[PDB]
Subunit: 115 residues, 2 copies
């Protein structure tokens, strides 16, 4: 009834699609465990990109490492470690890493969005 | 609901001192709270040196990510200390608590379904 684990030890999944490149995703608390919302840890390699998209659920993010470029419906904004982000349902968003080192952020979504 | 995206330095949020029968030496920042969240809330807890969130249980789950320091986790049986970069999943009704046995502040993110408050 209590899981305690080092996030780094969760095997990351490489994501490479027409919309996502240079990203790896760790599912920390996924559908097997979560009654309501899931916890993922994304690592964005230098030059990695999560292109703009939207979805019917909200997203809650905490920036763990580095300088994250946040794509908005209009323009972009760069945030750093120690920022949180709340993405309303349906809001256009994406992410890019313009720096020379890896960026990490924690991403939580309601379980309807999958893990 | 509303549109948009909030992007904010967590330390810009005004902490609240927590003091209850079972909690001493703790402050909390509500990052994404009831006034905005459709489903679950995001808090940043700071445990001062010596601070204690004593063993308890509640009828919602908790999801934690340790941001800073060495967090002692109190379990139904015994305890375990974890560090920055660990996550914790606490099932509904599972006994849990936390202590800071170190001389510097420990920080962790804590998310709960909004039915449990903020
Ligand atoms: Cu149990
Ligand atoms: Cu998204
Ligand atoms: Cu609790």
């Amino acid at each position: 009834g209590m899981i305690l684990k080092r996030a780094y030890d969760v095997t990351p999944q490489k994501i490479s699609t027409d919309k996502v490149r240079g990203v790896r995703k760790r599912v920390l608390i996924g559908l097997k465990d979560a009654p309501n919302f899931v916890m993922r840890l994304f690592t964005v390699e230098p030059g990695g990109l999560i292109d703009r998209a939207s979805h019917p659920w909200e997203e809650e993010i905490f920036v763990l490492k580095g300088k994250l470029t946040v794509l908005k419906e209009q323009g972009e904004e760069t945030v750093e470690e120690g920022f949180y982000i709340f993405v309303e349902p349906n809001e256009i968003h994406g992410f890019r890493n313009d720096t020379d080192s890896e960026v990490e952020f924690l991403c939580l979504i309601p379980k309807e969005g999958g893990e």
